[PDB]
Structure formats: structure tokens, C-alpha cells
Amino acid sequence: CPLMVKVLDAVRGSPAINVAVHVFRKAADDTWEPFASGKTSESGELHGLTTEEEFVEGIYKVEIDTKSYWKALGISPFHEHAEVVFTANDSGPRRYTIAALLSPYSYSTTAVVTN
Amino acid sequence: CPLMVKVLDAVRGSPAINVAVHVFRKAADDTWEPFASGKTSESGELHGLTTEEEFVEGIYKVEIDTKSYWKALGISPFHEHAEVVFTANDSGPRRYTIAALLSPYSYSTTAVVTN
Amino acid sequence: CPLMVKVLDAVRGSPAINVAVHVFRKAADDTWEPFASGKTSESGELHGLTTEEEFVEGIYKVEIDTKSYWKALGISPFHEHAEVVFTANDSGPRRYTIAALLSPYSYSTTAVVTN
Amino acid sequence: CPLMVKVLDAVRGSPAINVAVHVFRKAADDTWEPFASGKTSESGELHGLTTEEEFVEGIYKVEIDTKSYWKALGISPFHEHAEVVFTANDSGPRRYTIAALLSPYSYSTTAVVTN
Numbered sequence: 001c002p003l004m005v006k007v008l009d010a011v012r013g014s015p016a017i018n019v020a021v022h023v024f025r026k027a028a029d030d031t032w033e034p035f036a037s038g039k040t041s042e043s044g045e046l047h048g049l050t051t052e053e054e055f056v057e058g059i060y061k062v063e064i065d066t067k068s069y070w071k072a073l074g075i076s077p078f079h080e081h082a083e084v085v086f087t088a089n090d091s092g093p094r095r096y097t098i099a100a101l102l103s104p105y106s107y108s109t110t111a112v113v114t115n
Numbered sequence: 116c117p118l119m120v121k122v123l124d125a126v127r128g129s130p131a132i133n134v135a136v137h138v139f140r141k142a143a144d145d146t147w148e149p150f151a152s153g154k155t156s157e158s159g160e161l162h163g164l165t166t167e168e169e170f171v172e173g174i175y176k177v178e179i180d181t182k183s184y185w186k187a188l189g190i191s192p193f194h195e196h197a198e199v200v201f202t203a204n205d206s207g208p209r210r211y212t213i214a215a216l217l218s219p220y221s222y223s224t225t226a227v228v229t230n
Numbered sequence: 231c232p233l234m235v236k237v238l239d240a241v242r243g244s245p246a247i248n249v250a251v252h253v254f255r256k257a258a259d260d261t262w263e264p265f266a267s268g269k270t271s272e273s274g275e276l277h278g279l280t281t282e283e284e285f286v287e288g289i290y291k292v293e294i295d296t297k298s299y300w301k302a303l304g305i306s307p308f309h310e311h312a313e314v315v316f317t318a319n320d321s322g323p324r325r326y327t328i329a330a331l332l333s334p335y336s337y338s339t340t341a342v343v344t345n
Numbered sequence: 346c347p348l349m350v351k352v353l354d355a356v357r358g359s360p361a362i363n364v365a366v367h368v369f370r371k372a373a374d375d376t377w378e379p380f381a382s383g384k385t386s387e388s389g390e391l392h393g394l395t396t397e398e399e400f401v402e403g404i405y406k407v408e409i410d411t412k413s414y415w416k417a418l419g420i421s422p423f424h425e426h427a428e429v430v431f432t433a434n435d436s437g438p439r440r441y442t443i444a445a446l447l448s449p450y451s452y453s454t455t456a457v458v459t460n
């Protein structure tokens with residue numbers, strides 16, 4: 001699993017379940033091409049987006065559909081979505097965790113890059 | 116001043132100065148068109164992006180060029196930029212402050228919206 | 231104004247108003263003695279806590295009464311308060327802004343320190 | 346494991362290893378009595394602080410020794426430590442994760458309370 005997404009809810013103090021997540025790769029013409037997607041699990045985690053073979057160096061975007069999350073909870077949010085854009089680079093045997101902590105008008109995201 | 120951007124540096128404990136910010140507005144054809152741009156001042160704030168006349172309802176994207184920021188300081192950061200996307204003025208004119216706090220592998224953004 | 235405190239509410243996207251703040255300074259006998267207190271204003275800011283004469287070197291603790299804040303709004307939050315502890319003025323006088331962003335199960339705090 | 350601590354480093358994008366963590370329980374005389382302690386592992390996690398039998402309702406403080414962490418990395422930090430203070434309450438079969446994300450002049454903490 002070279003790429004995992006983990007989302008927490010700062011209002012409820014819980015994993016953010018069933019949040020849709022879309023990952024894109026930047027193509028040679030500078031467009032974003034769909035790469036991988038899924039819905040966070042009960043643990044707020046999304047595993048199995050990609051494989052080491054397909055996850056080559058390049059620029060990726062991870063879009064977390066925060067607006068739908070909040071709306072399903074009856075809560076008015078600010079952002080359309082949260083976007084995390086980064087370059088994946090093969091300097092070493094790397095796993096990338098993209099973590100996000102959500103509030104209705106604020107979010108933070110952090111990258112945990114290990115081995 | 117219906118739209119202001121404020122950026123702080125969590126490593127230095129200081130305003131993040133000379134950060135480039137580009138704003139875009141989703142067009143009729145579903146494309147991101149350029150709307151305004153600027154750079155943060157010595158206080159980390161960016162004022163004068165737009166006017167209340169110009170700042171009509173729409174979906175806006177505020178792209179904060181954090182990578183250029185960290186690179187100019189000898190740090191190779193994780194993200195390309197921080198993107199903040201939101202619907203604005205959908206219940207009449209409001210004043211928006213988009214704040215961001217930056218670390219090399221992590222950022223948070225919050226919106227303060229006043230009437 | 232060598233010490234200012236600013237608090238925002240990540241659920242509302244607004245300044246966090248009427249937040250009580252107590253400041254303490256570690257004494258010669260290793261005890262937390264009362265130093266100053268106040269409440270955030272309509273802009274979420276707390277000014278006038280101390281003076282440059284009074285604000286000598288020391289270890290200070292800024293206790294932000296987030297539980298009282300959230301309770302007055304029908305929310306049962308996780309934390310009792312947010313505590314910010316730091317050495318101040320150890321290389322001469324500085325001006326400190328202690329900022330905090332609050333959600334019911336989460337908070338962040340940052341310091342901006344200027345000369 | 347009713348109480349687990351997880352610490353991340355926002356500057357390096359990694360777990361924060363070998364951070365000392367001290368947990369206290371508030372006694373009837375309002376003093377903090379040592380309760381449990383340890384050092385975060387290679388995964389930035391600290392498991393096995395306590396047991397369900399000993400972790401009764403009450404007010405606890407978790408102190409994360411952030412200053413020593415940063416100093417061991419050659420980095421000048423702002424806070425003496427990060428403190429997280431909360432009431433543990435038996436409304437349900439609960440596991441408490443106290444997470445913290447560290448930067449030299451900023452930290453965030455979140456509580457993830459599950460089952």
C-alpha cells in the first residue's frame with residue numbers, strides 16, 4: 001500500500017466514515033486524470049487505492065469530498081472539498097499516508113511518509 | 116475588502132511573507148478562470164485582491180503557493196500548494212478571511228466569514 | 231501590548247467571543263501564580279493583559295477556558311481547557327501572540343513572536 | 346488499551362519517535378498525581394499506559410515533552426510541552442486516542458474516541 005488516506009472528524013472526535021476520496025494524476029497536457037477512488041471505512045481509512053507498480057513518480061491530487069460529509073450530518077460547511085496536491089518521488093522505499101482532520105470551517109492535512 | 120488571505124509559518128512562529136496567492140473563479144463552461152492574484156506582505160496578509168462589485172457569487176479557488184515559499188528557505192516541502200475552494204456570496208455579500216498555517220509536511224486552513 | 235491572545239471557532243468560521251483566559255507565571259517556589267486574566271472580545275482578541283514592565287522573563291502558562299465556551303453553546307467538548315506554556319523574554323523583550331483554533335474535540339495553537 | 350497517544354512531526358512528515366509522555370490524574374485535593382508514562386515508539390505511538398480497571402472516570406492530563414523532542418533535532422521550539430486535559434467518562438465502552446501534530450511554534454491535538 002504505497003498510498004493510504006485517513007480522515008478524522010474534529011467535531012465528533014471520531015473517524016470520518018464513508019467520505020469519498022478521488023485521487024488524480026497530472027497528465028503530460030497538465031490535466032488531471034482519474035487515478036483511484038474509494039470511500040473511507042469505519043476506521044476513517046482508505047486502503048488499496050493503488051499498487052507500487054502503478055504509483056510512479058509524478059504529481060498527484062487527492063480530493064476529499066468534505067462538503068458531502070458535513071451535509072449528511074446536517075451541518076453547513078465552508079469548503080467544497082479539501083484538496084491535497086503533492087509530488088510522489090522515489091528517493092527511497094516509501095509509503096505515503098495523507099491524513100486530514102475536518103471541521104466545518106477548517107481542515108488540516110499532514111503527510112506521513114515512512115520506510 | 117471582501118477577500119483577504121493571511122498566512123503564518125509554524126516553523127518560525129512568524130507571518131509567512133512574500134507568499135504568492137492566485138485566485139480563480141469557476142466559469143460558465145466549468146473551467147477555473149483567473150480572478151485575482153497577489154503576495155503576502157510583511158505581516159503575512161494579502162489585501163486588495165478584489166472589490167465588492169467584482170466579487171460576485173461563484174465557486175472560488177484560492178491557491179497558496181507554499182512550495183515556492185518553503186523552497187526559497189532551503190526546505191523541500193511535501194505539498195505543491197494549498198488550495199482552498201468554496202462557494203461565496205450565495206446568501207448575499209460576505210467578507211472572507213482565508214487563513215493558512217504552514218509547516219513543511221502539513222498545513223491547516225480556516226475561513227472566517229463575517230457579515 | 232507584549233501579550234495578546236486570539237481565538238477562532240472552527241465550527242462557525244468566526245472569532246470565538248467571550249472566551250475566558252487566565253495567565254500564570256511559574257514562581258520562585260515552582261508554583262503557578264496568577265499573572266493576568268481576561269476575556270476575548272467581539273473580534274476574538276484579548277488585549278491589555280500586561281505591560282512590558284510587568285511582563286518579565288519567566289515561564290508562563292496561558293489557559294484558555296474552551297470547555298466553558300463550548301458549554302455556553304450546547305456542545306459538550308472533549309478538553310477542559312487549552313493550555314499554552316512557554317518561556318518568555320529569555321533574550322530580551324518580545325511581543326507574543328498566542329492564537330488558538332477551537333473545535334469540540336480538537337484544538338490547535340500557534341505562537342507568533344515578533345521583536 | 347483504553348488510552349493511547351500518537352504523535353506526528355509536521356516538519357519532517359513522520360512519526361515523532363521517542364517523545365516522553367506523562368499522564369496524571371487529578372486528586373481530590375486538586376493536585377496532579379502521576380498516573381502513567383512512557384516514550385512514543387518508532388510508529389510515534391504509545392500503547393499500554395493503563396488498563397480498563399485503573400482508568401476510572403476523572404480528569405486526566407497528558408503532557409507531551411515537545412521541547413526535548415525539538416532540542417534533540419537541533420531545532421529551537423516555542424512551547425515547554427504540550428498539555429492535553431480532559432475528563433474521562435464511562436458513558437459507553439470507550440477507547441481514547443489523544444493525537445498531537447507538532448511544529449516548532451505550533452501544535453494541534455485531537456481526541457478520537459471510539460466503540
Ligand SMILES: COc1cc(CO)ccc1Oc1ccc([N+](=O)O)cc1[N+](=O)O
Pocket residue numbers: 006008097099100101107108109110112221351353442443444445446453454455457
Ligand atoms: C492532530 O492529529 C492529527 C492532525 C492532522 C492534521 O492534518 C491529521 C491527523 C491527525 O491524527 C493523525 C494523523 C496521522 C495519522 N497517521 O495515520 O500517521 C494518525 C493520526 N491519528 O491521530 O490517528
Ligand SMILES: COc1cc(CO)ccc1Oc1ccc([N+](=O)O)cc1[N+](=O)O
Pocket residue numbers: 123130214215216223224225236237238327328329330331338339340341342451
Ligand atoms: C492555529 O491558530 C491559527 C491558525 C490559522 C490557520 O489555520 C491562522 C491563525 C491562527 O491563529 C493566529 C495566529 C497568528 C495570528 N497572527 O495575526 O499573527 C493570527 C491568528 N489568528 O487567530 O487569525
